[PDB]
Design a binder for this molecule. Sequence first.
Ligand SMILES: Nc1ncnc2c1ncn2[C@@H]1O[C@H](CSCC[C@H](N)C(=O)O)[C@@H](O)[C@H]1O
Ligand SMILES: Nc1ncnc2c1ncn2[C@@H]1O[C@H](CSCC[C@H](N)C(=O)O)[C@@H](O)[C@H]1O
Ligand SMILES: [Cl-]
Ligand SMILES: [Cl-]
Lengths: 230, 230
Amino acid sequence: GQKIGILGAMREEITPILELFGVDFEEIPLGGNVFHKGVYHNKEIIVAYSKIGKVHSTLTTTSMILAFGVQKVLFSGVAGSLVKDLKINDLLVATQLVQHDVDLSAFDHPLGFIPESAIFIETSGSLNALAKKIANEQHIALKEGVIASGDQFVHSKERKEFLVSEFKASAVEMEGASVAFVCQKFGVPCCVLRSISNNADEKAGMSFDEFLEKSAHTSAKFLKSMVDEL
Amino acid sequence: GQKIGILGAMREEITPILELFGVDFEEIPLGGNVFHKGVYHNKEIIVAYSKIGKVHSTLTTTSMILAFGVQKVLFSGVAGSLVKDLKINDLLVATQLVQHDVDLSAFDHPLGFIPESAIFIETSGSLNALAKKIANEQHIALKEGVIASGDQFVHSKERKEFLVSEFKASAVEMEGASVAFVCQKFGVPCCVLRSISNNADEKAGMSFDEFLEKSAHTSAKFLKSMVDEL
Ligand SMILES: Nc1ncnc2c1ncn2[C@@H]1O[C@H](CSCC[C@H](N)C(=O)O)[C@@H](O)[C@H]1O
Ligand SMILES: Nc1ncnc2c1ncn2[C@@H]1O[C@H](CSCC[C@H](N)C(=O)O)[C@@H](O)[C@H]1O
Ligand SMILES: [Cl-]
Ligand SMILES: [Cl-]
């Protein structure tokens, strides 16, 4: 079958992935990352955590595509909620992503926009539709919405209000847009899956720590259930 | 000789490079970029502009290394000055670079710091020393200092004051840190060269436009003079 890249940002997001697949993994170092290469149900799977933020995740995604030849990329990890209906532990897939910290307003560009690019980055409608069917069959909620990504941990009402007002974002994190961007440039299907671990408000640091393990597992379990249908 | 990658962020930064080398270039598309491949003085040179900002430049640098096998990367382009002694048209090389917009302060991390990384990214002391010797021999100034990179065009006294206070930066731009970061991860020597086109203040947009062509040429000429010694 088609070779699948599986990414998280932090080690804690991929430890449950490696465990859930349960196969032998070969560890391959490249570019400051460790890639775990295995075979699962007649598919080659390549798993890594990128390290946090846009530069790290851009690098790792580019390596997955150029050095390992992955044919699709699935991202799993944790995020901050920007909307009341996304509770702690809830899942969402990103229909579109934006780099919320991009600002070329000095030249009258819309926030998020860079010349020769676009504000919103698209993901795979097929993979998102698959996620929604699996969630419906598992009888669990799954939101489909905009994820905002930037190189700051968001933990204030004011920044939340900006993200909602400017981009109508549903969640915030630090890698999705860059992963999805790289995949679009190389024509590789991508799905960005997140489980909420905090509300991106003044208490978000403490919530992040409280729920990292559970929310990371929630996302990882759901990602595995997608791979089982691929 | 050793294969050299040459990067700018914008087309206007590489047009003078292609012209100055004056050789036949083959255009090769990959990942949303166009790479110009030529031979100059027994060296293969690969020239591209990345498009603006951290994600674009991370992607392109990673492609240069993984897909084209470059053995060193030289970046040329324009920047905003943060220090009085860096005038319009003046050159600097980055001794160290920082991602000035990275903020994980919610977890008590220093600004600029990401777990499993470092605030400052190093460049090649050999290439920087070469630049300084060439500048001394050409009888022109060359500053050696910290460059701050982020995904915003900086055009305010307040943000300038932050960059100077927090990082002791000499100039600001949107790609150097990410280029240098990728090169460090892959063990590839890097030099980031910039010519000042504005003062990163409230008038910076208009200055940027006034001096883009000249400052881009100033940097490009100097980069060519480095390649001539390699
Ligand atoms: N409120 C929020 N804002 C930004 N990113 C968030 C977030 N909630 C979760 N994330 C995601 O989780 C990570 C936040 S940074 C976590 C740092 C960690 N506590 C440490 O100190 O080492 C990023 O990978 C990001 O994508
Ligand atoms: N004051 C400054 N702040 C941030 N980047 C700057 C800068 N001065 C020059 N740069 C560099 O020049 C570019 C600024 S963005 C330029 C956008 C352009 N005027 C347009 O509208 O299409 C980036 O590649 C950046 O690295
Ligand atoms: Cl915030
Ligand atoms: Cl500013």
